[PDB]
Paper text:
In Group 2, NgaAt was active against GalNAc-β-pNP and GlcNAc-β-pNP but not against Galβ1-3GalNAc-β-pNP, indicating that it possessed MR-β-HEX activity. Thus, NgaAt is a different linage of β-HEX from GH20. The active site of NgaAt in Group 2 also possesses a cleft shape, and the second β-sheet of the (β/α)8 barrel is longer than that found in the other enzymes, followed by an additional β-sheet (orange). Consequently, the space around the 3-OH group of β-GalNAc in the −2 subsite is narrower than that in Group 1. Therefore, NgaAt was presumed to act on Galβ1-4GalNAcβ- but not on Galβ1-3GalNAcβ-. Since Galβ1-4GalNAc-β-pNP was commercially unavailable, Galβ1-4GlcNAc-β-pNP was used as an alternative substrate to test this hypothesis, and we observed that Galβ1-4GlcNAc-β-pNP, but not Galβ1-3GalNAc-β-pNP, was degraded. Thus, NgaAt demonstrates more diverse activity than expected and possesses OR/MR-β-HEX functionality. In NgaAt (Group 2), apart from these seven residues, W329 establishes a hydrogen bond with GalNAc-thiazoline, and L555 contributes to substrate positioning (orange residues). NgaAt was inhibited by 25 nM GalNAc-thiazoline and by 25 μM GlcNAc-thiazoline (a 1000-fold higher concentration) (orange and yellow). The structure of NgaDssm (Group 3) bore a striking resemblance to that of NgaLy and NgaP2 (Group 4) (root-mean-square distance of Cα atoms [rmsd] = 1.5–2.3 Å), while the structures of NgaLy and NgaP2 are identical (rmsd = 1.0 Å). The additional N-terminal domain consisting of ~80 amino acids, found only in Group 2 enzymes, was not modeled in the crystal structure of NgaAt owing to disorder (orange circle).
Beta-N-acetylgalactosaminidases (β-NGAs) hydrolyze the different β-GalNAc linkages of various glycans to modulate the length, combination, and abundance of glycans. Despite low sequence similarity, the crystal structures of these enzymes demonstrate that all enzymes share a prototype structure and have diversified their substrate specificities (oligosaccharide-releasing, oligosaccharide/monosaccharide-releasing, and monosaccharide-releasing) through the accumulation of mutations and insertional amino acid sequences. The overall structure of these enzymes is similar to that of CpNga123 and BvGH123, which consist of a β-sandwich domain at the N-terminus and a (β/α)8-barrel domain encompassing the catalytic region. Among Groups 1–4 and GH123, the DE motif is located at the same position, suggesting that these enzymes adopt the substrate-assisted catalysis reported for GH123 MR-β-NGAs.
Author numbering:
A (entry chain B): 11 to 184, 254 to 642
B (entry chain A): 10 to 182, 256 to 642
Amino acid sequence: VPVEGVAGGGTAYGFNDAEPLKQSTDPSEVPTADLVNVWCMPNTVNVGSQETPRALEPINLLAARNERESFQIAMRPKVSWAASSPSGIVQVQCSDLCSSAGDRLVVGQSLKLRRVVPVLGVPDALVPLDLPVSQLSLFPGETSVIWVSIDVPTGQPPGQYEGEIIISAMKTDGEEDVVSNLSLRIKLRLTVWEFIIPVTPSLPAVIGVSDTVIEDRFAVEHGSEDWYKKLDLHFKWLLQYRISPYFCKWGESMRVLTYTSPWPADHPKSDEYLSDSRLAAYAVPYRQVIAGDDSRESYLRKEVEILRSKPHWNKAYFYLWDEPLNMEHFDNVRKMASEIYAYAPDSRVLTTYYCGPGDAPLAPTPFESFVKVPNLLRPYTQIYCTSEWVLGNREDLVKDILDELQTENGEEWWTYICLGPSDPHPNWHLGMRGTQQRAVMWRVWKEGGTGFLYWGANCYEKATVPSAEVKFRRGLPPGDGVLYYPGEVFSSSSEPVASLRLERLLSGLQDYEYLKLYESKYGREEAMGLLEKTGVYTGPERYTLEHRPIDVLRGEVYNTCRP
Amino acid sequence: TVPVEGVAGGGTAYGFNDAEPLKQSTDPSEVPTADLVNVWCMPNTVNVGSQETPRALEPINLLAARNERESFQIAMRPKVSWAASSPSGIVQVQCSDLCSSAGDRLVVGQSLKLRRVVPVLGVPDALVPLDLPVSQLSLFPGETSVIWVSIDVPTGQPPGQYEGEIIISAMKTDVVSNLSLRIKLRLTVWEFIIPVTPSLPAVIGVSDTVIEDRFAVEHGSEDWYKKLDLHFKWLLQYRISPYFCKWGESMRVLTYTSPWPADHPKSDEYLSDSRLAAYAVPYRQVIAGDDSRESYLRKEVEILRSKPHWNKAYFYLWDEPLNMEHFDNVRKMASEIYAYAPDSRVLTTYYCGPGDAPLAPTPFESFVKVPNLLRPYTQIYCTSEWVLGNREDLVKDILDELQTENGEEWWTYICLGPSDPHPNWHLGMRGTQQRAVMWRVWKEGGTGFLYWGANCYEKATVPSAEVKFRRGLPPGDGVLYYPGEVFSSSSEPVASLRLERLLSGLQDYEYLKLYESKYGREEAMGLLEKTGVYTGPERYTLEHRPIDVLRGEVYNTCRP
Ligand SMILES: CC1=N[C@@H]2[C@@H](O)[C@@H](O)[C@@H](CO)O[C@@H]2S1
Ligand SMILES: CC1=N[C@@H]2[C@@H](O)[C@@H](O)[C@@H](CO)O[C@@H]2S1
Ligand SMILES: [Cl-]
């Protein structure tokens, strides 16, 4: 290109005319592909409105049984094909996937389409499209994105499954089917392999759900019939993310009422929740959920006598106090825990903490005082659930925490994340990149804790209408405590809307299961070696910025770990 | 050929090598692999030691049925050093899928496997996994190094003539080129399907105390259940039915195929598996609980009696009762069980009658009369093979005391006896000697087989600890697989050659049972002997070819 530009257009005029456009903009005569750039992107990219076109190629995926695998379709107009509301409408159609044996992954039960919608300017909200056929408006100078996910049943026959998604530019009012030789066809190939991801999650990830948020936003009084229906809706939706929900009400000095099941242990609904195979751990409340006639002592005695008989009792825990800060708080936990043990001695009490007692240090520095918390609490806490931020980037001080615990007597180390750690550590703050979100569970895996807790999934600012704007609480990084959105904000559905962050939590929990499989076959040192040598994850400040390492890892698990 | 003074005056016997000269280069980026390394194939029944002498390379022509493993070995011996600093050098091994003319495939993961043959106590025995499809092997001067190639044909595979290659490449120190040496594999998959359910129940014990000690897994723990689970699943590929085993006072045994309570979903995943021909039910509790021993037993049998797979149950209660008090504890124990289930099969191992009140004036005659003392409180009479010496004609004397039209069965076992030259699995015994265990079992016509132990090592407290053989026993007795962790980082068990010959033998039984089903007992017996495969306990083929003459004759005559 000369100094004066092609044909005298001036400086830098004509550096690629990326192939002349067709002179017509009529979608009934021009291929969709000459009207709109369409390409695929990996599930770990947060695909902004200004992402640049790439050339479309086929998509080749891998999934085990009981695994959700995902990819994205990006669309950016080249022209107006609807002069009067630019740029135009595209119709999106998907199809069953079919193997050689004639087995199928069906549209609707396995295969789903959602639009990726920005929250605070960042790609985050996944809003359902109509199946099998939907329409999507495309705007000038904007990249618009669809999240495709495929849920493989536990019983699915292995094989190579194949299918197509069809994108057609439409003329709006300026029947037939809209699909034609002018349509653009994206080719899908998924290999289902012999692994079944355990039905019961290997890592209990317990996630809190504010009941006050539900009570206010929906307008449902605690105890009511409508309240019980609303909590039911949330509990059932959340289990598909390989997590263990608990409802949570905060009290005086950060005491907590935490309950997985709002139903008395008597009720048939209690066993339907607690004996669900997908639920790895459930909170039992300390006080009564609904106002009773009994005293709490009296209620808890009778609740525990029932639950301790049931075969799911091994999944129970009590969570009594959120971040005890001072000596009175740590004493209160001992007292409450000992009431519990009098009705059943094998009860598991979960305590979260970032610090020893402020008013009576257990050692001359804060970190050292923190390390001794188990010496103070023993034997009145079983699950020592510590803040990851406390470690900074010192993965080598993990041993300092563990050296104070007694694994051989049922004590366990768990971790949580919250307003810290911050960039460039793994977390779920809005603005954090996709791999950074997924790296939360790579870190959890590497460090060797036996469960995980996240304080909040719906912890918005207060609102009194279902479709009210989602506002983020003051003093916290936006996204902290917020993994899903009300459906009514984005459509007329009552079904929750997932965040990208919740999808990358699930994918991370799927990765954990892969790495646990690899470990069960080749040992701890080899599996640690796989995580690092692939480039997936080296340390809290050093993990992959791209997708490809992740496929290298999951592909090596497939190559080596089949039966 | 050569004169007294040798070629060019090299001295006595110099220049008798007809080997054509070597190349003057040793650079493996320029010299064909075949000029740097001798490579040849051997049969699956040779124990190929480190001084096996090179043969000319030829094509491999194999036969298998559906649901059959077939095998061969690849032997490699360096001719020169191609890595001057670390002799002799490294070769890369690469396998590819096998394809028929119709386009069917036998695949590398699932079908074709490669393992290194490693010596144990100086004898070729352990089969240690190589990486697939590409592995590396260090070769050392003046030594023959050996790879075991096995091909598992799926039950549903299309008949056909499948073809492929294994490629061996000397490395410089992925790298395949025109210099690489190519071995040609041709496998005929024929019509026969080998029954999914083994036709002979071969029950194999697995010591639970060995697992608990060596892997540091507390009996009952969740880690223990995982460890037992891994062993069970791995052993079912060998056409055997495992049982875990703890010995008690005076050689009482607690035996159990499943560690899982009978109501647990995992119990029926094990016990209803089509490959499991017989399973052991424990007399007392595996995992200590609240119910007394009689209340546990009745509850368990009630659940099991109702299941479709209950015809496979048996109870193994005493290992080798030796005096009158032992034979009488068995009768008491059995009779307790018959109160809950009259139809239960009780299995008893023995080599002798009661020594303190003999049943007859000589020990062989006392042994033969054991069923008349135990009846009706044993249904499976499992007797020591060693007691017969080389007398196949005295089997009749055992069977004549049994009431086989009242579901009494005759099974056999081997152990520290019999010894050379009889068939057994003692380290040092020859390949076809190991395989002849099942030839003998077939010819003598018992309806089952038991082996006391497959992991019966001396005691150790770390997974990768040296494997030591128990005192007073021929090494290998009681040991058919090794810990994977001794040989790599893997938790998967390592098979012995002897376990592979056991499988080969069990596959031979299914070939002979097919020929019998078509042509009758007397023609089947004639086949076995007139091919040279097996004449009797001290006379059986020392070479592979008769085994192929036998299998090929079954293919030509039962190809329908
Ligand atoms: C277990 C936890 N306890 C605290 C919560 O109540 C919230 O304040 C949260 C905000 O990030 O921080 C920590 S995470
Ligand atoms: C059924 C058997 N019982 C005995 C076992 O307990 C071991 O002592 C073995 C040693 O070879 O010999 C016999 S075989
Ligand atoms: Cl055929």
